[PDB]
């Protein structure tokens, strides 16, 4: 909620990834810029929720 | 008398002293330096301000410094050689030559 | 007592800006500001437009 | 006799009014506690000072 | 007040605490999560203009949270800071740990410690909406059991009502508080030794804190908000208390 | 050095009164050492002896 | 195009920061105790803790009265004495001629408590503990410290004279 | 210079590059700044005379008190200094050793005496007006600001004629009689 | 003798060499109590030897839970047995400092030649490990601790409070 | 807190002057004696429920 | 200027004057004191508090 603040860039992650374990182990880089994409990969690795 | 920084082009202190200046020297660093006027030896800072008017050293034609004792020496047209401590202000010795 | 002891050679550096009436007593403007003595033509042109 | 009052004629009435006058002085000297909230209101009503510091100092 | 009253927010001398000046003055702090009151207290909204933002301010209830009673009492320097970290003890609900989270900002975090699972479920639910709060359901008397989760807090605040308040604060401050860090303890005289009076309890507990190398700086009775209480604010010296 | 008393007190003391209980950095350890060995050979002029 | 009235630049002796003596460059009101009336201090209830100085100790030896059961006669209620670490340090700094009064001071029935001062003054410590709490009762037998504690309200003081003690500010004298 | 720490400050209690014992508390630059004298040796040139007054002060007092040679002498010197203006008291004679001061002798200089007659805005702006050639003592203007004005001569210091320093003064009063081209 | 000490980071365990012992007679003094504040003085006392990070957040939760019950985990047993020299279980056991006094019998049951020390001396050193933290590990840390403390923080809090997202 | 500019001035100084002289708005209030100069950083908000 | 030999006393001490002290030869942190009351106390000087 605090790294990708765009409304539809958030939503299309949810259509693609469902679990934070799924987001770390599989592809997301199509719909994100790479410096943001690598940093949500750290977010999918260690997180809060 | 100009407290000249030399390798770079800066000038720390420029002074126009209307008495006949004879000899000036840095004493402990580049900051504090002491000039010798017509009748009295003055001591200056990096900004060109006066610090003390030395009541002794009543003639200073040749003024030198030796660094490991903080010792300001003066001997001019007067026969006397006066040793002065720039660390404490005590005139250490007054030799009548 | 201050009247008899004027010493008519004094200068304070506000003798330029402060004016005096022809009768003898000093004058002070109603606005009191040092900027609203009058109005320039660019101000008058804009203020009449408003 | 100089004209005294009905208050001095009884000690029990005098001790009551002397105590209630001393109680209102005590509320003026220090902020004593009174009740809590049986109603709705949240904070205070007499203003909040900034540089007040009504705390005793623990000097060594 | 009502839904049409207006106030002027002026910053209090303590940083992070703000003052709402109206017809009556109020003690207010800027909220983390807007729109929802953590325990039903009222809240103030301002708008600042770039497109505008609507940041919401939340009032601090003095009679339910003992820290707010001490602020309007007036302290020399409450060590809870706009940037530092704070170790709460005894935060059952968010009666005050929401506002302590509000005064330390997003840069600092707040470590809420409580025992019972019934208010710890509420402490879980709030700490996932204010990201600076993390809760400790682990027992506060034994800091060894939760030493994984806390690293070098800067402030410790006591609100637990066990009679061994001096032992439970020293055992936390010896291992989690930084040097020269602030120690705030809300001393309750009924919960420590009810057989003896209030000032005897206050003299005893500030002496036990001096024995455990916690120098006291100030005490405040907070009388008009709560009977028979005190807060003792002091600095953890640990090296030459004299 | 632990010292008793007739006053009922058991005081504990230092061996050398100028040293400290710290662990020092290698710069401070050398310079404190250098103050000691230079003091050892230069004991014999009387104004080192006057202060010591 | 020079300026006018040129003067030699010198040392601005009341202004510069290179001197030692020009290196210099929240209202406080301590509240009254909430357990204190005008003059009562209603928190004075049994048991009691007395603060002891040397002039209390040395006169009690002079007047043949031991502390714990001697405190029983005047104050008449249950009370235990406590002596600060500062006081016992300076009481035993009197030396050899009061060591019997030293021995009566160190006793398992006389409680002791620690201290935090960069000093050993008995009068300054006893007042500061009194100011910060208004909880204790003080035993003193010199006029300098007695007037210092008589000027703070609500603090019971006791002294010794004749054969036994005498309390001053306690309402429950009997 | 480094705001030296305690373990070396006790070793260096007596060091100061800025303040020395021969510098007599910096009373030279203190009375120099207050009264705005230009060069550096002018304070000490007064101090030799102010020391010489005190030298004749003490040497008058080893004499017997009821000496007829004494009875004439210091009253002659007191009237000399009163007409000088350096001391402004005829009653005491102990003032001729105590109240005789360089600050007593430098307030009788010209630019201070402007400020006592309120003819200048400050004590420094008098030096500016004296050096620009505006100030006369009787017939002639003097340009040296280091002029001691006699107590009698204090009455006659005006502005010079036909000058712009006088025209502004008379224009505010609406008094300019330009037949005398003032 | 406090020859080895142990700190347990939120991501992994660590075993530290103690090169110098602060003198424990004057352990309440002004000088030695502030000597852990300076990183230039604490690093003469301590030096890293081993640091085995936790393989995942799920492994980090149960390992932190096993410490909370006062039991030695598998990863703690693995990192200690392969760092402590095999000393005697009868004479002059190797001294290892643990922040928990309760973990003493659990370690010595598994490792009979190692003794657990939790004094004021041991607690002051382990507090100094927290005080410097990331500086002492020479960058070996698997991830930032400032998220690792928070990540394990809600893991242990939610599991002990026993609630579900359903 | 954001700085007060010299705009929206008619709606702010009326509130500031009323808060500064709030001791006479109601004869039955009697606030603490204080000064309350207009602060150099402040803001305006309304209480909502 | 750094000669500060007193560094602290142990506990509250005994009550008549210790006439026998024995340091622990195998451990750095312990000693035993006994005074004229026939009371013996075991001291940890790390905390400067008696065990028992």
mmCIF file of N, CA and C in Angstrom, chain E residues 125-162:
data_model
loop_
_atom_site.group_PDB
_atom_site.id
_atom_site.type_symbol
_atom_site.label_atom_id
_atom_site.label_comp_id
_atom_site.label_asym_id
_atom_site.label_seq_id
_atom_site.Cartn_x
_atom_site.Cartn_y
_atom_site.Cartn_z
ATOM 1 N N UNK E 125 -5.179 -5.890 16.444
ATOM 2 C CA UNK E 125 -6.009 -5.311 15.390
ATOM 3 C C UNK E 125 -5.651 -3.856 15.119
ATOM 4 N N UNK E 126 -5.178 -3.138 16.135
ATOM 5 C CA UNK E 126 -4.796 -1.748 15.924
ATOM 6 C C UNK E 126 -3.399 -1.635 15.328
ATOM 7 N N UNK E 127 -2.489 -2.534 15.717
ATOM 8 C CA UNK E 127 -1.091 -2.437 15.313
ATOM 9 C C UNK E 127 -0.874 -2.768 13.842
ATOM 10 N N UNK E 128 -1.863 -3.350 13.174
ATOM 11 C CA UNK E 128 -1.798 -3.567 11.738
ATOM 12 C C UNK E 128 -2.472 -2.454 10.951
ATOM 13 N N UNK E 129 -2.943 -1.408 11.627
ATOM 14 C CA UNK E 129 -3.399 -0.189 10.973
ATOM 15 C C UNK E 129 -2.511 1.007 11.266
ATOM 16 N N UNK E 130 -1.851 1.026 12.423
ATOM 17 C CA UNK E 130 -0.752 1.942 12.671
ATOM 18 C C UNK E 130 0.531 1.134 12.583
ATOM 19 N N UNK E 131 1.344 1.303 11.537
ATOM 20 C CA UNK E 131 2.495 0.407 11.346
ATOM 21 C C UNK E 131 3.622 0.597 12.348
ATOM 22 N N UNK E 132 3.633 1.682 13.121
ATOM 23 C CA UNK E 132 4.685 1.858 14.114
ATOM 24 C C UNK E 132 4.441 1.057 15.386
ATOM 25 N N UNK E 133 3.251 0.500 15.567
ATOM 26 C CA UNK E 133 2.977 -0.333 16.731
ATOM 27 C C UNK E 133 3.269 -1.782 16.384
ATOM 28 N N UNK E 134 4.013 -2.462 17.250
ATOM 29 C CA UNK E 134 4.076 -3.916 17.265
ATOM 30 C C UNK E 134 3.718 -4.384 18.669
ATOM 31 N N UNK E 135 2.868 -5.390 18.816
ATOM 32 C CA UNK E 135 2.458 -5.809 20.155
ATOM 33 C C UNK E 135 3.273 -6.967 20.693
ATOM 34 N N UNK E 136 3.381 -7.043 22.014
ATOM 35 C CA UNK E 136 4.037 -8.151 22.694
ATOM 36 C C UNK E 136 2.996 -8.751 23.631
ATOM 37 N N UNK E 137 2.469 -9.925 23.276
ATOM 38 C CA UNK E 137 1.558 -10.632 24.168
ATOM 39 C C UNK E 137 2.342 -11.363 25.254
ATOM 40 N N UNK E 138 3.657 -11.481 25.082
ATOM 41 C CA UNK E 138 4.520 -12.162 26.035
ATOM 42 C C UNK E 138 4.571 -11.410 27.364
ATOM 43 N N UNK E 139 4.741 -12.176 28.447
ATOM 44 C CA UNK E 139 4.649 -11.667 29.810
ATOM 45 C C UNK E 139 5.702 -10.609 30.104
ATOM 46 N N UNK E 140 5.254 -9.490 30.675
ATOM 47 C CA UNK E 140 6.113 -8.342 30.917
ATOM 48 C C UNK E 140 7.073 -8.540 32.078
ATOM 49 N N UNK E 141 6.793 -9.479 32.985
ATOM 50 C CA UNK E 141 7.665 -9.675 34.138
ATOM 51 C C UNK E 141 8.990 -10.307 33.738
ATOM 52 N N UNK E 142 8.998 -11.097 32.671
ATOM 53 C CA UNK E 142 10.200 -11.793 32.221
ATOM 54 C C UNK E 142 10.631 -11.242 30.870
ATOM 55 N N UNK E 143 11.635 -10.365 30.829
ATOM 56 C CA UNK E 143 12.079 -9.813 29.542
ATOM 57 C C UNK E 143 12.870 -10.792 28.705
ATOM 58 N N UNK E 144 13.334 -11.895 29.296
ATOM 59 C CA UNK E 144 14.038 -12.919 28.537
ATOM 60 C C UNK E 144 13.129 -13.605 27.532
ATOM 61 N N UNK E 145 11.835 -13.696 27.835
ATOM 62 C CA UNK E 145 10.938 -14.473 26.992
ATOM 63 C C UNK E 145 10.577 -13.733 25.709
ATOM 64 N N UNK E 146 10.742 -12.409 25.681
ATOM 65 C CA UNK E 146 10.451 -11.620 24.488
ATOM 66 C C UNK E 146 11.646 -10.805 24.011
ATOM 67 N N UNK E 147 12.867 -11.216 24.362
ATOM 68 C CA UNK E 147 14.057 -10.461 23.987
ATOM 69 C C UNK E 147 14.384 -10.553 22.503
ATOM 70 N N UNK E 148 13.655 -11.371 21.742
ATOM 71 C CA UNK E 148 13.852 -11.414 20.302
ATOM 72 C C UNK E 148 13.337 -10.139 19.658
ATOM 73 N N UNK E 149 12.242 -9.612 20.191
ATOM 74 C CA UNK E 149 11.345 -8.726 19.472
ATOM 75 C C UNK E 149 11.650 -7.254 19.693
ATOM 76 N N UNK E 150 12.448 -6.911 20.702
ATOM 77 C CA UNK E 150 12.744 -5.523 21.034
ATOM 78 C C UNK E 150 14.252 -5.329 21.000
ATOM 79 N N UNK E 151 14.709 -4.327 20.251
ATOM 80 C CA UNK E 151 16.110 -3.957 20.283
ATOM 81 C C UNK E 151 16.377 -2.482 20.511
ATOM 82 N N UNK E 152 16.972 -2.160 21.667
ATOM 83 C CA UNK E 152 17.428 -0.824 22.073
ATOM 84 C C UNK E 152 16.364 0.257 21.876
ATOM 85 N N UNK E 153 15.302 0.124 22.656
ATOM 86 C CA UNK E 153 14.338 1.204 22.762
ATOM 87 C C UNK E 153 14.984 2.389 23.476
ATOM 88 N N UNK E 154 14.389 3.565 23.312
ATOM 89 C CA UNK E 154 14.952 4.769 23.900
ATOM 90 C C UNK E 154 14.163 5.217 25.123
ATOM 91 N N UNK E 155 12.879 4.886 25.196
ATOM 92 C CA UNK E 155 12.049 5.273 26.326
ATOM 93 C C UNK E 155 11.273 4.068 26.829
ATOM 94 N N UNK E 156 11.032 4.032 28.129
ATOM 95 C CA UNK E 156 10.204 3.017 28.763
ATOM 96 C C UNK E 156 9.104 3.715 29.554
ATOM 97 N N UNK E 157 7.863 3.282 29.352
ATOM 98 C CA UNK E 157 6.743 3.888 30.048
ATOM 99 C C UNK E 157 5.984 2.756 30.731
ATOM 100 N N UNK E 158 5.736 2.920 32.028
ATOM 101 C CA UNK E 158 5.078 1.913 32.849
ATOM 102 C C UNK E 158 3.622 2.284 33.063
ATOM 103 N N UNK E 159 2.732 1.327 32.825
ATOM 104 C CA UNK E 159 1.333 1.481 33.190
ATOM 105 C C UNK E 159 0.780 0.214 33.827
ATOM 106 N N UNK E 160 1.606 -0.813 34.025
ATOM 107 C CA UNK E 160 1.154 -2.049 34.648
ATOM 108 C C UNK E 160 0.933 -1.807 36.138
ATOM 109 N N UNK E 161 -0.038 -2.512 36.716
ATOM 110 C CA UNK E 161 -0.462 -2.268 38.088
ATOM 111 C C UNK E 161 -0.023 -3.359 39.056
ATOM 112 N N UNK E 162 1.032 -4.099 38.737
ATOM 113 C CA UNK E 162 1.537 -5.093 39.668
ATOM 114 C C UNK E 162 2.355 -4.416 40.770
#
